[PDB]
Amino acid sequence: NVPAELKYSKEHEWLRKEADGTYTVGITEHAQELLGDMVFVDLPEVGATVSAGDDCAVAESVKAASDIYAPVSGEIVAVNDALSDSPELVNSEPYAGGWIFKIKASDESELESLLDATAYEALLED
Amino acid sequence: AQQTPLYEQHTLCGARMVDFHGWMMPLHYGSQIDEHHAVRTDAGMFDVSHMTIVDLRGSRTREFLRYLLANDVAKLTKSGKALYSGMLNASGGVIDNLIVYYFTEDFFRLVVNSATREKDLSWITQHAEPFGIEITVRDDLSMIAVQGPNAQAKAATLFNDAQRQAVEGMKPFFGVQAGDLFIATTGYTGEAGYEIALPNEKAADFWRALVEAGVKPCGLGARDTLRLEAGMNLYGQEMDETISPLAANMGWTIAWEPADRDFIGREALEVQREHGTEKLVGLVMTEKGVLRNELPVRFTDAQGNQHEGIITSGTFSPTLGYSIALARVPEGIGETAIVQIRNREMPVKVTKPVFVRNGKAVA
Numbered sequence: 001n002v003p004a005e006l007k008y009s010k011e012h013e014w015l016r017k018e019a020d021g022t023y024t025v026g027i028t029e030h031a032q033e034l035l036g037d038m039v040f041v042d043l044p045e046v047g048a049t050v051s052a053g054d055d056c057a058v059a060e061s062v063k064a065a066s067d068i069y070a071p072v073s074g075e076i077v078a079v080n081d082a083l084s085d086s087p088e089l090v091n092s093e094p095y096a097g098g099w100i101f102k103i104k105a106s107d108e109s110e111l112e113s114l115l116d117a118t119a120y121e122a123l124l125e126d
Numbered sequence: 127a128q129q130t131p132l133y134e135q136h137t138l139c140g141a142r143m144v145d146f147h148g149w150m151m152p153l154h155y156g157s158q159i160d161e162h163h164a165v166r167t168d169a170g171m172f173d174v175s176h177m178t179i180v181d182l183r184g185s186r187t188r189e190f191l192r193y194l195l196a197n198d199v200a201k202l203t204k205s206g207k208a209l210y211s212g213m214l215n216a217s218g219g220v221i222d223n224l225i226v227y228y229f230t231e232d233f234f235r236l237v238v239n240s241a242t243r244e245k246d247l248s249w250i251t252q253h254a255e256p257f258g259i260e261i262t263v264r265d266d267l268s269m270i271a272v273q274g275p276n277a278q279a280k281a282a283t284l285f286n287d288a289q290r291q292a293v294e295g296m297k298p299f300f301g302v303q304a305g306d307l308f309i310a311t312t313g314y315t316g317e318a319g320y321e322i323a324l325p326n327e328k329a330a331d332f333w334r335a336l337v338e339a340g341v342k343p344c345g346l347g348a349r350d351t352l353r354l355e356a357g358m359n360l361y362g363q364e365m366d367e368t369i370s371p372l373a374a375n376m377g378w379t380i381a382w383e384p385a386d387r388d389f390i391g392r393e394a395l396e397v398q399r400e401h402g403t404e405k406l407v408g409l410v411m412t413e414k415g416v417l418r419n420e421l422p423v424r425f426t427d428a429q430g431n432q433h434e435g436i437i438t439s440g441t442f443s444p445t446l447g448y449s450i451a452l453a454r455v456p457e458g459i460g461e462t463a464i465v466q467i468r469n470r471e472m473p474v475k476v477t478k479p480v481f482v483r484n485g486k487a488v489a
Contacts, residue, residue: 036347037159039442040414060416062158062347062442091157
């Protein structure tokens with residue numbers, strides 16, 4: 001529910017640092033629970049520059065459209081095209097096949113302010 | 127908010143509870159999509175204990191109902207037969223859509239929705255009085271709907287021998303009391319199944335037995351997707367007191383013949399039908415996206431002239447794999463329309479107001 005090794009955001013997203021320095025981003029187990037079954041996702045353009053807090057993707061459930069926010073500032077270097085065909089991966093694999101996009105972070109101070117597994121568990125605890 | 131006798135059973139089954147018209151009810155139990163698939167392909171069940179069951183008794187029951195309702199209960203000639211009918215005001219607007227069962231000449235039963243309970247009970251007791259009807263509100267009963275191609279066989283695993291005998295080969299739209307179970311071949315999904323009403327104190331254990339019989343718990347999310355695919359109306363959305371049944375695809379439930387049966391609203395409805403009305407149609411959006419309630423529906427006629435209707439209910443259809451909607455529209459619409467979804471004009475196909483029959487897409 002909260003993989004030990006990921007970093008987390010307050011908008012209920014995780015970030016996994018990759019070998020090449022980029023970050024894979026998705027929504028957490030908590031977030032997908034609250035969304036319910038996903039039926040479409042609208043992904044950003046590869047190459048888009050975002051600021052932390054920009055609404056840059058949309059998860060659509062049977063009930064509602066729900067905005068997904070950039071957790072850090074940077075450039076979108078990849079998006080998860082499997083989601084066009086299998087959007088339910090966001091629900092069944094929110095830390096695995098349900099990843100949403102990958103980002104080249106442009107600001108180290110944002111990265112240093114993201115929650116570790118423990119500090120995320122405590123944001124739920126609340 | 128109030129809760130049914132099943133509230134604890136729903137929590138043990140993993141319900142996500144929401145407030146629904148002052149009732150805590152399961153929105154789903156994990157996956158509304160999977161829940162919809164269970165009803166389409168096997169068996170799913172829904173707590174419908176927030177519906178109100180009204181028993182009516184007395185020698186003028188039939189006569190009363192022939193005046194109260196816009197369908198004609200004189201069509202119920204076999205014991206336990208049910209029909210769907212609107213119940214209209216004097217202006218011909220819809221007060222509710224309800225089901226009614228005939229048991230004997232002097233005993234009928236109505237089932238009414240949760241959201242319209244108090245308005246319907248006042249309208250019924252106001253109008254029944256001069257007919258001398260004994261009216262019983264059965265809040266002592268809960269009710270479970272079990273729906274899908276394996277629903278009747280799974281539920282019938284819980285029946286005793288007399289109960290199985292009572293429902294053997296029962297056709298759609300019948301209900302029969304068999305011990306403490308009232309078993310009816312009705313539903314809100316497009317599928318076969320039962321709605322089973324039983325005493326409140328028996329309902330938790332019956333739900334438990336149905337789970338164990340392989341019937342999946344299904345919540346409000348799937349109840350909406352299933353009913354909407356099946357082209358079934360939701361009061362407040364497809365109709366309300368301002369809307370004629372003729373403009374909510376309820377024309378088929380108006381029993382115009384015999385002409386000499388007056389019923390509340392019939393005069394106004396005859397006048398409406400002569401002036402013509404708007405009509406409820408289906409919309410299918412095959413492009414990516416989801417149709418939502420109250421969106422404008424626009425089309426341009428043969429002459430260059432624009433007309434506008436409105437979505438009454440939209441959703442994503444898991445059986446179709448496309449969004450669908452029911453929409454009330456001017457007469458004159460052709461085969462396609464446009465619906466405005468957040469600043470963009472999405473084309474849609476206009477179809478009959480039903481999308482799935484027998485687990486199969488109807489196009």
